[PDB]
Amino acid sequence: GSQAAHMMSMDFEDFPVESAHRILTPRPTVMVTTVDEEGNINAAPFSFTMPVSIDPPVVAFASAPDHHTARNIESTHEFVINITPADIIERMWVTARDIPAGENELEAAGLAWTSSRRVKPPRIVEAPGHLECELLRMFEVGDHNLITGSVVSASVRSGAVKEGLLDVESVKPVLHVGGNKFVVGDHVRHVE
Amino acid sequence: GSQAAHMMSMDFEDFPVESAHRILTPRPTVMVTTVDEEGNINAAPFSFTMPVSIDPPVVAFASAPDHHTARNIESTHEFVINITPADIIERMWVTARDIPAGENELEAAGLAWTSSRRVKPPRIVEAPGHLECELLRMFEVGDHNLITGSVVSASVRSGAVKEGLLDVESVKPVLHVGGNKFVVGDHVRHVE
């Protein structure tokens, strides 16, 4: 092997495969909003998320199949991904509490919501960026449901975009490390 | 609507749906290694990635179908996800150059690799965390291929784990904002 490879031959440790998600971090933490058939708003944070296709715009996120978010999407086929700025990190955290079905956790979080342009579920006012999505497919994978969706509409808060990109320095997106540990992503470093 | 919703009724702007991935940021940037049938090592960075299932461990990442990474997985059905620490950000960036097929971009990047425990493709020495994966499914989605994989093995560098989580403070994982802009995720903030 290469000399570098040779001297590190002992620097590695086996790590539990069921803790794999803890190595693939930090991850963007988003609040996903949905509605049930009665129109009740539901909101919850998710950190297993990622874009999939640029054009057509298709995004994805993984949810436990039992979550209100999972079940609402299965029945109303829509959801809005809301970016989480650090200024409301404690509030998004509250939206994770196990609030009764049909109840809007945005209320208990002291967050506000406004209508979306193309879908039923709302956009969170405090969120600087929103991705209005239409269900594509809900593939079941292990203990989660891989949910992909077509982005039919996108909106941003004034000043949240810098040169076409999310103005992280301003927005300071919340990233999940694991448990109650997070990373505020306001550290811009260009490669050039 | 709520008073908060009312005063923000004009604070939002429509945003191109084909720029949706730019709102869902910053994202973990990983170098995925694979091999072709001849055993040639290939390495490339990806920022559309996310865990999917915790147990069984299933991870995912999106790649252009034409990439060497996509084609290698299709033929050898394996790949290793390698976390990118900020100390080699310029080097991982080089692995993105359009190096000829069959050529190992790790070499041109001045990076080293060592054998994996369960799969053919290698683990990058400079990477503090590795996820050895076996292809699960390569669902085509728009202009990308959603690739999921079973994590058959995981390994970390000594000191890269703090209380079961990726020691971001030490590792300083590289997060992609878009283009050549990144975020070093070494800003731990607990919610409590």
Ligand SMILES: Cc1cc2nc3c(=O)[nH]c(=O)nc-3n(C[C@H](O)[C@H](O)[C@H](O)COP(=O)(O)O)c2cc1C
């Ligand atoms: C930062 C953070 C990230 C989370 N990410 C996920 C995730 O990716 N997938 C998931 O299934 N649950 C995730 N959760 C847990 C859910 O938010 C939680 O189970 C919530 O009660 C679900 O609400 P619902 O039943 O109204 O959908 C996360 C929680 C927090 C605090």
Ligand SMILES: Cc1cc2nc3c(=O)[nH]c(=O)nc-3n(C[C@H](O)[C@H](O)[C@H](O)COP(=O)(O)O)c2cc1C
């Ligand atoms: C920070 C960063 C993130 C990237 N993320 C992705 C991604 O998620 N999906 C993708 O298809 N290409 C992505 N790319 C581009 C590929 O790395 C690039 O096309 C590379 O040449 C692919 O190599 P391959 O053909 O050897 O697989 C990214 C590049 C950089 C610098």
Ligand code: NI
């Ligand atoms: Ni709920």
Ligand code: NI
């Ligand atoms: Ni429908």
Ligand code: NI
């Ligand atoms: Ni290549």
Ligand code: NI
């Ligand atoms: Ni095979």
